[PDB]
Amino acid sequence: MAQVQLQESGGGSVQAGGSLRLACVASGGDTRPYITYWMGWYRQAPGKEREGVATIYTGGSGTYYSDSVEGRFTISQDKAQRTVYLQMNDLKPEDTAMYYCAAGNGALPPGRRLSPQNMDTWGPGTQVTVSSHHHH
Amino acid sequence: MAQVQLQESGGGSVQAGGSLRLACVASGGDTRPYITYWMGWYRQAPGKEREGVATIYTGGSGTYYSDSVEGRFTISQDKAQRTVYLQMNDLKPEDTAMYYCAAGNGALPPGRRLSPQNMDTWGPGTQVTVSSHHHH
Amino acid sequence: ATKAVCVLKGDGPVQGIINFEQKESNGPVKVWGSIKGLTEGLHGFHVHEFGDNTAGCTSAGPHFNPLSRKHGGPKDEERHVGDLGNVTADKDGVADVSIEDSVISLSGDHCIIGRTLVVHEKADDLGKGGNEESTKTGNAGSRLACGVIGIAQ
Amino acid sequence: ATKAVCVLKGDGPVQGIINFEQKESNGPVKVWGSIKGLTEGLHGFHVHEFGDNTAGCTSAGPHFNPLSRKHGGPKDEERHVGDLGNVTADKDGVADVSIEDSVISLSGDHCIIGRTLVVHEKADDLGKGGNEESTKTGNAGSRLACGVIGIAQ
Ligand SMILES: [Cu+2]
Ligand SMILES: [Cu+2]
Ligand SMILES: [Zn+2]
Ligand SMILES: [Zn+2]
């Protein structure tokens, strides 16, 4: 338990319309059980800014999603294992990006919970690549 | 005025018994005039830990020195120019090291003011090399 | 005074602001505000005796108890003056508090101004735990955030 | 109460702890503690009206002034109840305070418990500046650190 550290896993290659599950494991940091975070999933596509996708409150159950992914992605957690999952369904080619895990202060207010600037810790990233059907 | 940044200058090569003056210029950061620091000079010799040499309170005039340099080094400041000077006299060969400027919180208590672990900002360093008379 | 306010801060992420009003002497106190960063569920909520936060929430001492009574809930008759029961945090960790109490006061012998309000790690069992600590603390656990109660405008 | 205490924090590095004692009702108040991180020299030192630090020291309001008087020093007769003059910071930025005042109190109409103590950027001119602000603030400048005054153990 030095400082908080996040590790993503589960990225890969899938054809449009397919599914993917990503996992983000948290280790270290203040391990007292009342230390809460907004955990939770960001993207960076080629040539665009880093954007938030989904977030979840590790001290409870509230979840929030970006417009671009509402309905298709779902975020969940196994609190005992400090793992936050992103279940990505009906994948489009534009979901291609490096996907990052990020932890923010548990007191973050509505509208900062899913903003990259208010994140304290970042993971290294796992790449997600989605093929067009038009890629014969 | 982004974040505080320190720049050392004035290091060089001198024979034992000689003198040297180093300067550390501070730029940026919160520039409100009541923002005080313990500014102030550290060493790292080959194979040894980083050690404090002298410190000075930018909000006043108190100064404190390591035992190894008391009597020979003097620290001063030109507050209007945010520059802190280390006047090094009667130089010995063991004063050879990379010399760093460092800024610590102005509320630092006695005994943390000159400890590297409590420093917030470090400069890049200026090298000081002192020749033995025995280097013909 | 008839209006008071309190900023709660602590070690972890828990923080909030609580307001107080009794609009007439020895009447009921309306306490309202909101606290963020809590774990979803119930959290103990009392006024402790000292408004000394030099050593954090630890130096606040125990529950404000001028009547030398056992621990209870706010509705109970066997109670500390400072027993305000629980606040409930939603699924985002926010607990919006809006409560009425008539045993605390902003003047007189049970004045709470200058004392410390504290949010707790665990639920207060309101003195019905069946052990000795339950009659002291409600087994509410550690103090996540606290502040001194000041005269408010 | 006969004992009070205050933790002063603010934007910059200034911080400290101040204790209060009046060992008998309506008697003199002994204020003592120390404040670090100040610029060497004099700094204004007053009790402001509200112990609301939600918006920092700004929400504390003006000098505690129940008599509706002009600004002065502590020895002056024309004074705010909260005028405590200056504290002097040494060459290390530390000001050790040990002061007696008899117009402030820990009970009664001029009770300072639940209000805010404030250290200032500049010296208080104690009302003798010759302008209008001097009769309000002593031209003491911005508020570097403050805290609510609580009941102490
Ligand atoms: Cu409690
Ligand atoms: Cu003032
Ligand atoms: Zn109790
Ligand atoms: Zn005044």
Side-chain angles (χ1 to χ4, degrees), chain A residues 54-73:
Chain A
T55 188
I56 193 176
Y57 185 58
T58 74
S61 65
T63 54
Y64 299 92
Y65 303 83
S66 73
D67 278 351
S68 38
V69 308
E70 184 86 61
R72 312 183 296 125
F73 295 6

Side-chain angles (χ1 to χ4, degrees), chain C residues 106-125:
Chain C
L106 294 195
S107 59
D109 278 350
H110 308 172
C111 189
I112 63 164
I113 299 201
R115 308 190 192 260
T116 296
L117 178 68
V118 179
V119 201
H120 275 271
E121 166 188 36
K122 269 157 298 150
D124 185 352
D125 62 33

Side-chain angles (χ1 to χ4, degrees), chain C residues 18-48:
Chain C
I18 296 298
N19 301 83
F20 300 87
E21 251 197 65
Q22 67 169 5
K23 51 205 152 145
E24 55 148 279
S25 162
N26 277 2
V29 191
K30 291 306 209 302
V31 316
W32 60 275
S34 80
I35 318 176
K36 338 285 182 188
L38 295 154
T39 46
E40 171 174 24
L42 273 64
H43 294 275
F45 196 52
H46 336 99
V47 174
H48 293 231

